[PDB]
Write a protein that binds this DNA or RNA. Structure first.
Ligand code: 0KX
Ligand code: MN
Ligand code: MN
Ligand code: NA
Ligand code: NA
Length: 326
DNA sequence: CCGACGTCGCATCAGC
DNA sequence: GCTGATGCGA
DNA sequence: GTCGG
């Protein structure tokens, strides 16, 4: 983290633009700049040095000059002082509360943690669970706990049906020493792009993880995606582990490589890779890579037998999971 | 200069 | 009820 | 907010 001060600054600008301004492309611009600067292997000494980097334009270069000369940015100094901004920015930290609801809550004079706790009846289910575990969801997960969680998820899934394959993705698969949550990719032979021979494939798994008190709460759930809450079991007289977010994605088994590419991330890596695909005239989702007809209309799914196959189509040298952390 | 900028799942609402 | 848009999230 | 064409 040679340039921690700069990337911190930009990320806070990105978060302001998303949460307060509701300007998503500015949020994306700041995040790209932050990402490209994070991996730049020199300590940056000027706005002009940084502007060489793609994603760093004129405006951000000027901010880096100010930041480097003073250690602060007056634009942020002011945002930090603004009641409305700070309130809105804070409320969005609760899972299920985004920019729209946070500004609406603020409009009704709900703007502190205490105000949320008194107005639980004004929250939807997701927001209510997010409020409940606000404290725990602030804490990161040590990789060592991630390994214990992996153990449990894989063994419980096996007990439901040995032909399930469960794969932990996200920052875990990228080798991170701590993660924000756990991401689990699920496949089963009965669910392919061509047919769903068995129903409740995700539900049965979720049910089992609840039965053993691993999954404690549900934020959302359908046939292919689960979002919820889980907790490691603790020992006698031990303090309980924090509750953790968990996401599960059931992917058609024949489309595992697109699915694991997607769920491994990072989010910025996926966005840049999909953008680059479009420049090369392909489109990538979690299921397929497809060519773009001169029209614009996507064509038929191309054969894919490895993650690398996907990289090969768009003329990118392969990158290991641990190197996709943009 | 200029829009053109990843892709999709589930919850909730509006309009019918 | 269904359809399609909006919010929030992966 | 950036920038390719
Ligand atoms: N905007 C987003 C968010 C998520 N992702 C897909 C890939 C991200 O790695 C991933 C899993 O989402 P995530 O859990 O929110 N982030 P990730 O696991 O990479 O890092 P953590 O903050 O969980 O440690 O899903 C995406 O493609 N676009
Ligand atoms: Mn994750
Ligand atoms: Mn996740
Ligand atoms: Na640049
Ligand atoms: Na939120």
């Amino acid at each position: 983290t040679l340039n921690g001060g700069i990337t911190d600054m930009l990320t806070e600008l990105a978060n302001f633009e998303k949460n307060v301004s509701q300007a998503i492309h500015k949020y994306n611009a700041y995040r790209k700049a932050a990402s490209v600067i994070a991996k730049y292997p020199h300590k940056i000494k000027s706005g002009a040095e940084a502007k060489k980097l793609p994603g760093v334009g004129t405006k951000i270069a000027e901010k880096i000059d100010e930041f480097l000369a003073t250690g602060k940015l007056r634009k942020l100094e002011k945002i930090r002082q603004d009641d409305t901004s700070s309130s809105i920015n804070f409320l969005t930290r609760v899972s299920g509360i985004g920019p729209s609801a946070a500004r609406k809550f603020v409009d009704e004079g709900i703007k502190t943690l205490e105000d949320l706790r008194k107005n639980e009846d004004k929250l939807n289910h997701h927001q209510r669970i997010g409020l409940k575990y606000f404290g725990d969801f602030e804490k990161r997960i040590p990789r060592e706990e991630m390994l214990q969680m992996q153990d449990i998820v894989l063994n419980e899934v096996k007990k439901v049906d040995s032909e399930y394959i469960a794969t932990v993705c996200g920052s875990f698969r990228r080798g991170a020493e701590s993660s924000g949550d756990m991401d689990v990719l699920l496949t089963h032979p009965s669910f392919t792009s061509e047919s769903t021979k068995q129903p409740k494939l995700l539900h049965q798994v979720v049910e089992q993880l609840q039965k053993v008190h691993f999954i404690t709460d549900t934020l959302s759930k359908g046939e292919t995606k689960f979002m919820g809450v889980c907790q490691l079991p603790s020992k006698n007289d031990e303090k309980e582990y924090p509750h953790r977010r968990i996401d599960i994605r059931l992917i058609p088994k024949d489309q595992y490589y697109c699915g694991v590419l997607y769920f491994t991330g990072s989010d910025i890596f996926n966005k840049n890779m999909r953008a680059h695909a479009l420049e090369k005239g392909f489109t990538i989702n979690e299921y397929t890579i497809r060519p773009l007809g001169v029209t614009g209309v996507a064509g038929e799914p191309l054969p894919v037998d490895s993650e690398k196959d996907i990289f090969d189509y768009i003329q990118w040298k392969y990158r290991e999971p641990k190197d996709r952390s943009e």
